[PDB]
Amino acid sequence: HKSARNVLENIGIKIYNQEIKKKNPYEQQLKGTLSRAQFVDALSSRYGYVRNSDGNSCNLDHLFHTNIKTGYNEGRKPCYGREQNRFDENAEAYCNSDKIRGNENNANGAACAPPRRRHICDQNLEFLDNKNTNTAHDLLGNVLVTAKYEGNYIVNDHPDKNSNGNKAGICTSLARSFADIGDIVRGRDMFLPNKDDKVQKGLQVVFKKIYKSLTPEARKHYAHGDGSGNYAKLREDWWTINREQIWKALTCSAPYYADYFRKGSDGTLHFSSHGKCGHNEGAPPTYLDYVPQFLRWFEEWSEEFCRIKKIKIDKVKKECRDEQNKKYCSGDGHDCTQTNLAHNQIFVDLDCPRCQDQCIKYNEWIVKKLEEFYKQNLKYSMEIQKWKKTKNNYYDKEFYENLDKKSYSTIDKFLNLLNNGKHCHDNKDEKNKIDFNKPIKTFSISEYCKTCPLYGVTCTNRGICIHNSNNKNKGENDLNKINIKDKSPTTFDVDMIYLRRQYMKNELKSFVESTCLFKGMRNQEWTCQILKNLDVCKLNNFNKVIDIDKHITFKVLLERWLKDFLEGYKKSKRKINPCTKDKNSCIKLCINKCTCVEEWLNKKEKEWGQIKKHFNKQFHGEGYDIAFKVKSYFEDNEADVRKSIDNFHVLKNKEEYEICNVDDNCRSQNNKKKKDIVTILLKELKDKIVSCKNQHKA
Ligand SMILES: [Mg+2]
Ligand SMILES: [Mg+2]
């Protein structure tokens, strides 16, 4: 049981000491002399100068140690983009195919470019192809400016920045930037921000010139059997020589009390004594620049997930569970502390809606996070298999080999190290214990986002709230007693969207099936019945692991269904859109689309029939009918509603009356009751399928 960073470092040294075992004969041709660097910006060119640095990397200024001759950056800043807050809880990683090398749509496995990498300080490196950049020295000073300013940003933005304890976290983030800078220099970096590829294109042009500048012996050595230059080899070395200098400009801003720590294969403690992340100590305390990018990134992803999850949960606790301050709420937004409870009062607006707002958000993050953990898990397998399979060579092989030689042969053994990370391990509560080998619990929706205990809670002076049993029994029950038209139960099954199915798949398979329209559908068999003055719904097929609550109110259920309907309606309108396009364009694949929609459409039509069947078992007062409940919900949720529906405003004020059914509520003297938004939305969507069905027919 060791940390993933400690292990990846231990493997890294074995690679580093292998590089320095051999004494480079051409070392002096690749070692850069800072003082010797030549830079020319727009003003420098205007005024007719060539700026040089002094000895100190710590006295480097972007206004003079840059080649930036562009219009956009007149300030000549190394950080010029969305490089504002990388440690933000809402800062996103990138896992798609377009902006990553090796990540391709087809293969489900993908590496995740952390926010910190996405916004590195290399805008000055986009300027490397020019008449003044032709030496090992020039290049170093460019890497040196980048390292300084990037190292600055990390220190003046870090969460541990003001921390009372040890500032170890700052060094760790620098080590991450250092390694990423290295992979950039080397040509090894996988992030492709734009097809322009200016750092990499320029970085090529520099090394081509460095190569010609070399001696015949050195040129012959850094060459390919065909005579061509082994630019790859040239570049990995240039990094090994210069890396000490790159670590100085980086740690140039690091605080006195920040020290890079790491443990040995045995368990020996390695620390940077002098301080400032080992700034005045020479040789770097890190070997992370000798760890493949993917692993560094995965270890970063895990460590940031664990960190932000603590922030996210705390924001959820703030709106849903602060018993010390008489706070207790449902994820369906109801104050459980209340004497007279809003959760069984169907027409009543919701008290505590900030809780529901927090839960929806938290859930959406945890599922974004889950998708990333799935993608990376698959790539770790793709990479750990690749080493045994391929006979030929690539730079990473040697590392992945060693990893398999340690117990970390498979994903499960490695995910154990991810659990042991500084942030992931730090939990004195087994409620929020992180086990990446238990994706179910670790990617679960918070326990604070559960429905109110049906009877409510009564808070105490002691700083906690207690679950009351059969609370306020028959108190003001005389009023709703006459409003009970049917006390029999009503059973129906509902097709809830469970998108956590693409990932987790082996664990879910049994309970969640993928539909045509969704990569996950959860069939919930409900029994709704009026007991006392509260209509409770029981989940027949209840599974704690996958379903949140066993018992809910009918009001809670309706709104869940209504949330789900809109979502599904949106998805449907989306999948049917190319076929619906007015132009009489024949498409074969369109037939299977409309059939899919009809599959979901019909299910819901059948679903709602049963839900109205339960609604009508109670009287809420004339005009306080389901058509009005549907409007009330759609009004109070105008954001979501506008994203799903085409013209809500015309629908909201649409008066269509239908046959008055068996529905006890219909007390209208032979008059026909008005169609609800749900029924009109379905019956409208239907006509759209009927059109498509006959617009792609043989
Ligand atoms: Mg690609
Ligand atoms: Mg299926």
Side-chain angles (χ1 to χ4, degrees), residues 1 3-81 83-468 475 479 482-486 488-580 585-587 589-664 666-668 671 673-696 698:
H1 70 297
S3 337
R5 212 188 80 252
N6 285 340
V7 317
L8 297 176
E9 282 276 338
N10 296 342
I11 307 166
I13 338 159
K14 291 167 79 203
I15 314 303
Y16 172 65
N17 298 349
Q18 211 174 235
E19 284 300 302
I20 71 153
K21 191 145 128 79
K22 179 267 294 152
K23 164 87 220 129
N24 202 312
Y26 322 109
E27 175 162 332
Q28 267 49 66
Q29 302 209 226
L30 314 167
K31 177 76 261 184
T33 312
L34 181 49
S35 43
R36 280 161 71 31
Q38 306 212 302
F39 320 89
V40 179
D41 76 77
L43 280 355
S44 262
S45 169
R46 219 228 269 171
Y47 312 151
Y49 288 77
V50 169
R51 238 280 197 187
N52 303 292
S53 177
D54 57 280
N56 217 180
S57 49
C58 284
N59 315 332
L60 284 166
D61 155 273
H62 73 285
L63 297 157
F64 299 109
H65 313 311
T66 243
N67 277 312
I68 311 152
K69 288 198 178 100
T70 188
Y72 70 76
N73 196 348
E74 290 144 66
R76 291 100 67 210
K77 317 120 193 138
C79 328
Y80 187 94
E83 6 265 273
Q84 255 59 244
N85 202 262
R86 282 127 72 177
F87 306 123
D88 190 39
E89 71 201 71
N90 282 108
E92 286 196 282
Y94 191 98
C95 316
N96 305 346
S97 105
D98 267 278
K99 290 152 88 187
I100 301 181
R101 288 153 188 151
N103 281 8
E104 307 308 318
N105 10 51
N106 39 88
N108 248 140
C112 298
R116 190 215 40 88
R117 161 73 193 87
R118 291 185 74 176
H119 310 296
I120 222 117
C121 297
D122 66 334
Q123 260 63 287
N124 67 120
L125 301 178
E126 312 196 359
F127 290 95
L128 257 22
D129 171 32
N130 60 65
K131 292 114 283 148
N132 59 100
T133 348
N134 344 263
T135 77
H137 319 100
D138 302 346
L139 184 71
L140 163 101
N142 275 91
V143 185
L144 294 201
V145 159
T146 286
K148 179 196 170 285
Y149 284 78
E150 170 73 21
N152 226 298
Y153 176 100
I154 306 292
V155 305
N156 305 307
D157 206 50
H158 206 266
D160 288 65
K161 194 162 109 104
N162 287 315
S163 71
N164 290 293
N166 76 324
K167 293 143 157 283
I170 297 106
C171 305
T172 308
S173 309
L174 293 167
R176 270 152 209 193
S177 294
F178 176 55
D180 272 352
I181 281 162
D183 273 21
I184 278 144
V185 174
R186 302 198 275 212
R188 292 179 182 185
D189 189 74
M190 69 212 289
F191 189 79
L192 213 195
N194 46 133
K195 317 265 190 184
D196 314 34
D197 219 354
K198 350 92 224 79
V199 171
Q200 238 50 244
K201 273 209 265 291
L203 221 40
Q204 278 158 201
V205 197
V206 184
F207 284 104
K208 196 118 175 117
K209 286 176 180 156
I210 301 169
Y211 182 82
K212 304 178 204 108
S213 307
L214 298 171
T215 61
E217 302 81 0
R219 283 199 303 280
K220 270 182 224 145
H221 171 74
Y222 292 109
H224 282 306
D226 53 284
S228 66
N230 198 147
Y231 298 112
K233 208 220 297 209
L234 186 77
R235 282 214 209 186
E236 292 161 66
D237 293 30
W238 192 87
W239 183 265
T240 328
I241 332 247
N242 304 275
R243 81 188 283 282
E244 206 176 296
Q245 282 218 80
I246 334 275
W247 187 253
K248 254 236 186 200
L250 205 82
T251 58
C252 181
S253 298
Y256 275 62
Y257 336 94
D259 303 310
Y260 191 80
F261 300 110
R262 57 153 277 266
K263 264 196 263 175
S265 47
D266 32 33
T268 314
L269 345 302
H270 294 264
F271 81 120
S272 75
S273 64
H274 276 114
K276 278 207 55 156
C277 299
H279 187 69
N280 290 96
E281 298 176 36
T286 193
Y287 305 87
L288 263 176
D289 46 330
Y290 294 104
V291 177
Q293 203 156 47
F294 169 72
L295 296 166
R296 292 195 312 258
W297 285 3
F298 207 173
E299 186 276 328
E300 177 149 25
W301 181 96
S302 76
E303 281 293 271
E304 282 296 284
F305 162 78
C306 302
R307 184 177 77 79
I308 308 308
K309 203 211 191 188
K310 267 168 251 170
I311 286 140
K312 297 296 204 201
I313 282 292
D314 267 281
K315 231 293 151 190
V316 152
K317 217 156 168 184
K318 197 196 172 187
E319 318 291 27
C320 304
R321 196 92 89 254
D322 187 24
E323 306 191 50
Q324 274 281 27
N325 293 275
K326 202 225 165 62
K327 186 121 214 221
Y328 206 127
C329 296
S330 65
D332 33 75
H334 298 291
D335 172 61
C336 320
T337 85
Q338 272 298 101
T339 40
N340 170 246
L341 276 143
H343 75 7
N344 41 74
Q345 299 170 254
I346 165 120
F347 277 100
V348 170
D349 223 330
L350 37 144
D351 45 338
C352 206
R354 263 154 46 218
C355 179
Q356 175 186 289
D357 299 330
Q358 225 44 252
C359 298
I360 275 170
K361 280 216 303 297
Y362 181 87
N363 193 80
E364 289 170 322
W365 175 76
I366 245 298
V367 162
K368 175 87 215 81
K369 241 63 210 149
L370 181 64
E371 185 169 328
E372 292 176 349
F373 169 85
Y374 168 82
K375 273 144 174 291
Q376 292 187 284
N377 269 232
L378 307 184
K379 198 75 154 199
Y380 180 96
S381 296
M382 284 155 183
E383 300 304 86
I384 208 120
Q385 261 110 73
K386 171 96 172 292
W387 134 84
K388 242 165 183 141
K389 159 63 75 185
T390 51
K391 277 129 265 73
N392 52 114
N393 257 67
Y394 53 94
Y395 47 89
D396 309 305
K397 199 185 181 176
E398 306 91 289
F399 194 103
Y400 286 123
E401 177 175 84
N402 282 224
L403 239 187
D404 196 271
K405 301 258 184 70
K406 320 268 176 170
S407 78
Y408 335 107
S409 311
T410 159
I411 185 75
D412 344 275
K413 345 271 101 128
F414 175 71
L415 287 189
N416 250 120
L417 304 154
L418 292 192
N419 294 346
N420 293 301
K422 184 180 181 164
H423 292 290
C424 311
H425 195 277
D426 185 20
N427 287 82
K428 36 68 71 181
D429 45 274
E430 230 74 338
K431 256 191 175 183
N432 322 22
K433 228 316 109 242
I434 303 107
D435 174 32
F436 289 101
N437 287 137
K438 221 293 127 283
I440 283 291
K441 236 111 291 298
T442 60
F443 290 90
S444 69
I445 170 58
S446 190
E447 60 147 6
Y448 304 121
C449 300
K450 277 201 288 178
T451 192
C452 283
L454 64 137
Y455 298 114
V457 288
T458 34
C459 301
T460 80
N461 332 258
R462 305 235 54 207
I464 77 294
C465 306
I466 245 303
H467 292 71
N468 44 49
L479 43 110
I482 228 292
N483 291 80
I484 303 153
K485 301 282 105 75
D486 189 315
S488 76
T490 157
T491 216
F492 52 86
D493 77 298
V494 294
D495 249 25
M496 228 90 302
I497 300 147
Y498 205 93
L499 261 18
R500 302 198 175 179
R501 237 284 282 213
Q502 3 198 347
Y503 338 107
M504 304 208 277
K505 201 166 184 173
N506 171 98
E507 227 335 280
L508 303 184
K509 186 61 250 90
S510 6
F511 324 93
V512 190
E513 243 286 77
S514 79
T515 174
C516 161
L517 223 175
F518 299 88
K519 308 241 209 297
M521 267 305 194
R522 167 52 162 179
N523 200 274
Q524 287 171 291
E525 31 210 335
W526 288 108
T527 332
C528 295
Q529 195 187 18
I530 302 169
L531 287 327
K532 303 137 75 146
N533 275 22
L534 43 155
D535 65 343
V536 183
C537 297
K538 179 192 75 80
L539 194 49
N540 298 313
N541 71 121
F542 169 76
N543 183 25
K544 68 277 162 64
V545 172
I546 87 133
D547 306 294
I548 340 92
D549 324 276
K550 188 161 64 273
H551 310 288
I552 74 172
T553 77
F554 179 61
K555 181 245 235 284
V556 169
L557 180 59
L558 223 187
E559 297 190 325
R560 275 201 203 172
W561 195 89
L562 286 163
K563 191 30 236 289
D564 204 76
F565 174 80
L566 285 178
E567 196 163 325
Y569 187 94
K570 177 185 167 181
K571 247 248 80 183
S572 299
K573 251 195 180 156
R574 180 185 120 108
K575 297 286 133 170
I576 206 170
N577 202 21
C579 323
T580 64
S585 23
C586 211
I587 326 141
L589 36 135
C590 261
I591 280 307
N592 303 48
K593 290 173 158 64
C594 298
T595 305
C596 186
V597 187
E598 205 193 325
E599 201 222 299
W600 178 91
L601 165 128
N602 285 329
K603 226 294 206 180
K604 288 286 163 289
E605 192 168 329
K606 282 206 218 81
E607 275 190 13
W608 204 52
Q610 286 305 281
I611 99 93
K612 292 155 100 172
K613 197 168 268 190
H614 200 252
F615 185 89
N616 303 320
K617 288 189 164 183
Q618 205 167 27
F619 196 52
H620 314 277
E622 208 179 328
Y624 293 89
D625 64 342
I626 197 153
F628 178 65
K629 178 57 206 146
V630 174
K631 227 180 145 217
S632 287
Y633 190 87
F634 279 28
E635 287 182 351
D636 306 12
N637 280 271
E638 235 178 299
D640 318 30
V641 186
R642 287 207 230 105
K643 179 70 200 230
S644 309
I645 326 302
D646 271 333
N647 303 54
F648 165 59
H649 310 234
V650 86
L651 239 356
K652 192 240 197 89
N653 305 103
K654 180 92 289 312
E655 292 184 335
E656 234 99 282
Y657 303 81
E658 69 182 356
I659 98 289
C660 244
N661 219 7
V662 255
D663 319 333
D664 13 1
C666 177
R667 294 176 190 218
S668 70
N671 312 144
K673 216 218 110 171
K674 203 151 74 190
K675 277 144 91 182
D676 319 69
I677 323 156
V678 187
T679 142
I680 56 209
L681 282 165
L682 291 154
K683 281 64 169 183
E684 82 122 82
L685 223 212
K686 262 207 287 292
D687 301 321
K688 281 95 222 143
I689 284 157
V690 185
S691 72
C692 144
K693 238 219 89 174
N694 292 82
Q695 266 55 94
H696 303 280

